[PDB]
Design a binder for this molecule. Structure first.
Ligand code: MUA
Ligand code: MUA
Ligand code: MUA
Ligand code: MUA
Lengths: 294, 304, 303, 296
């Protein structure tokens, strides 16, 4: 049966985490590491195990770790964590939690970066801008086997909430037209895409940042996406994200696959001649889900 | 993974065939829906191997524009002759796959936009208006449907799920959370009497998918009835935890509705912190952002 | 300008003194509030010339911590012996200015957290539960109060306003919008029969502020009653615009409640776009721009 | 009463607006102008006039400009606007609207910038791909009236920067405040102050807001950078103390300004671990705020 419980929106902010250094750079991005003067993460934790059943069927709380205590667990482990990535932090929390509570058979963690951008001061080492734009993500699932060994069964890293608009050099023509079609063909649209991008490594260890040369930074994925979007006379969103995926896998052969969840929020044209003027479209949004592997 | 589609397709229909002839339960006065106003928010996703080249080559020759999917959904609400969201989804899914023979799989999510009745004084009395309705942001019915086209051009449903989403319930007393693990990570006090606040999403699956459509309404399980089972069971129960509560809600649901196979709960704990203990009244406030949650299925095996 | 304070101070009280003894109107079955559960979201703003140096010198000696204001509000809900949000604000405002003599002005907004009854089966029958309530995200009552301390240490109310916020009403037929200006900027078709959708905020003021408190409940205007007037008038009326509609709602309010001085409307149009005209019909959500109207109905408009 | 109506969430995007150039720089900010390859604004329009009364009282739509038409007016006017600022775009719309509809006595415009940031492409800044930002954005406010002699006058103008979220990890205190029966807040000599800032300013001379003489225009980007520089430089004693100092620096850098208004909120984290860097967490819902005007 499905049987899990836990805690969501566990925010944790750490100052002066160990800097991320020695990353492999790529052409699309100036990214070369993270100072980690300020490091914030939003964590959601889910745990299960068959011995949790009576907490549901009988109201027996004997084996119930309070979700409040899980919040505490996560917050204190951020204080003790000696690594450099959100992926590595999740692995630290998972391993530690399962070693602590032996009746838990499965733990699933999601981590979302709270991004902070640098600011100018007469670049500050003290003042940061809390950003509401794109942010790194990490996902980890770990199990306790019947021989009491622990194994990672899933790991995925990501970039969420990237909103890109290309003002020209985009088309969407040639699609099916029939009784339900009113969309006109457009040989030059200002394509607006909302991108979530997730990748899996060939070797799960590479995500931890232990050998930083192998670590794929979300910042680098961001810049690949904007470069490829720029370079490409897009034929659809589908066309674009395939090519973004291919470029990612070329740049990072230590990656096994890249997953995209994209949305289309392209503006409606109001004045064609006239520069041009556009407006926000109605609520319905197009979306695409696609994996490139490898 | 290869899918594409359209979200936030809103469609509002006036004078849909009413839902009546349902079977009642003790926990609920629900007797049907007059459907003067019927509103749904639909998400559609489609797949098929023949869509590959739309990604790999930028060839749109087999692409149904998602804008067309929108039009398809909205136009089908106009010709829908059925009485439920679940049935509406089945109607759209079947029509869509019949229309687009190169599409192999479709997935539909429908969320009710709920409307509540209002009062008017007309012709000398105060009574429920047949014209003016209040749009509600509280709990709402949901439906989910996945259908495939087989090689012989027949269509099959491969998953169906109905639901009640967004139910926010607070019980002011008669709840405890004691006896949980207290170790070096614990700062939560034991509480023999708390005002438990739960956010509930309840999802059910039928033993026979046909019962979901409302064609034989006596087998249809209405989200409004599930709502009322949830509020009745909460009231009846000296709860020992949210875990304990949702098990008892699922048991009552499956006892009342033998046509159902299982019930799934996604619940969140948003219980208030106490500020003033004495003082029969008390004062509480909103807690901080972290929220507890539970994910649990009650099945046939849990029934005696 | 110089004010500071605290927002989103939530406070939930059980078994507040019930509101009863209100006067009824034909449009509403409202008979009072049992107040098993009473919830409010409060915002407090304070001002005073003596706060200046907290800004200009970083001197905090006359600063009431905004955290302490939160405690103040939450604690006073515990001691409040009244029956309305309006009276709760007056109690908080009066106590606060009495406590902090260097504060010259205080502004308070209270927003009801509304809860609805649910059914339970117990002791053999199905009936309204006295324990389980549904938190509502729909329309909610509001209150506003400004008070000052005068030189002789007396207190005066300088503005009071009550309201109903977030009422979303759709009337499926019996609405028109025709005869408006049609020029080089006009692409809206005339429509003799539209399903008008209005988002309503309605705010009223009393001729005597004391009537707002609930102390003499027969003079109190409940937001629930205003709600039912709005739905009733919307129903009764072959509307010619939202402008037309809200004028007639205001007229009915002022006619039913002669203790009210004026009623203010902030309305928004969210009327759906028609997709199918002949089948019942089908509509969908419009694009993001929304029309709005801001209008006060007053005594002179009566009757 | 009060009698207005209008349209909100009128979004309008323009490509290749005339670029803003020739701006006076300041120490705190690298800002030198705007390419305007992509310009977006969210407009709200409100209009009034005594002759609109019967549209309310009688259901007479004869003098009603449909709010839908107002939307069209704004979008069309962005197509023909030859200027370089949101402030200037609001004056263009206001003047043109009043000149068109003589029975309208007052118009109020709010413009909010939809900010777009530059992106990388291969190895330089893209002239085609921009990132839509949910962070801080420029604002403008304009009120214009027709007088009884049929002259038009601007009665209020205000520029702004909204939505700026700054956190300073150390070098902030909050001590010495009133302690009584209602105080539980401990004194803190070193907190990680998190402020949410809205900053609004008014010019001595309204025409300076339009950008016609760029050297006199005050850009929201410049205000942003002053705010972060001052926050950096200052061992703050309160949010009140900080925003006064930010205000003072703005008025010294920009003597063409008459005033600066602040609406700030305090969202500082709770400390969980003091001794390990430190660890903090998100506070509960209540938020402190401050409202203050600094004048010249
Ligand atoms: C505009 N548009 C649709 O309507 N559908 C689609 C699609 O599937 N892919 C696109 O890139 N654009 C688009
Ligand atoms: C308060 N609280 C927690 O912290 N965890 C849990 C839990 O798992 N179940 C509860 O009912 N309450 C609760
Ligand atoms: C549809 N519509 C507009 O565009 N403007 C207006 C208005 O001012 N009042 C309305 O009732 N409707 C409407
Ligand atoms: C923490 N804190 C309060 O509680 N009030 C105030 C205030 O007015 N100003 C601050 O800078 N901080 C603060």
């Amino acid at each position: 049966r499905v049987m899990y419980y836990g805690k969501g929106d566990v925010f944790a902010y750490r100052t002066y985490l160990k800097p991320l250094t020695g990353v492999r750079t790529i052409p699309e991005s100036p990214f070369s590491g993270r100072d980690h003067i300020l490091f914030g993460v939003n964590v959601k934790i889910s745990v299960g195990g068959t011995k949790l059943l009576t907490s549901f069927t009988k109201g027996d709380n004997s084996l119930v770790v309070a979700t409040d205590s899980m919040k505490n667990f996560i917050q204190k482990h951020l204080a003790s964590y000696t690594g450099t990535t959100i992926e590595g932090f999740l692995e630290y929390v998972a391993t530690s939690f399962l070693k602590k509570y032996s009746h838990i058979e499965k733990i699933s963690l999601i981590g979302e970066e709270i991004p902070f951008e640098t600011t100018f001061a007469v670049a500050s080492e003290l003042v940061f801008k809390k950003s509401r734009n794109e942010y790194a993500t990490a996902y980890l699932n770990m199990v306790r086997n019947e021989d009491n060994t622990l194994n990672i069964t899933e790991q995925q890293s990501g970039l969420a909430g990237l909103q890109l608009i290309k003002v020209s050099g985009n088309s969407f023509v040639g699609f099916i037209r029939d009784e339900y079609t009113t969309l006109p063909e457009d040989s030059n649209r200002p394509l607006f895409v909302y991108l979530n991008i997730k990748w899996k490594y060939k070797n799960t260890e590479d995500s931890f940042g232990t050998n930083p040369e192998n670590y794929v930074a979300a910042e680098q994925i961001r810049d690949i996406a904007t470069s490829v979007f720029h370079e490409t006379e897009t034929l659809s969103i589908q066309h674009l994200i395939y090519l973004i995926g291919r470029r990612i896998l070329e740049r990072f052969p230590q990656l096994q696959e890249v997953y995209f969840e994209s949305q289309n929020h392209t503006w409606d044209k109001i004045v064609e001649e006239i520069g041009k003027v556009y407006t926000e479209p109605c609520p319905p949004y197009g979306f695409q889900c696609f994996t490139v592997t490898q």
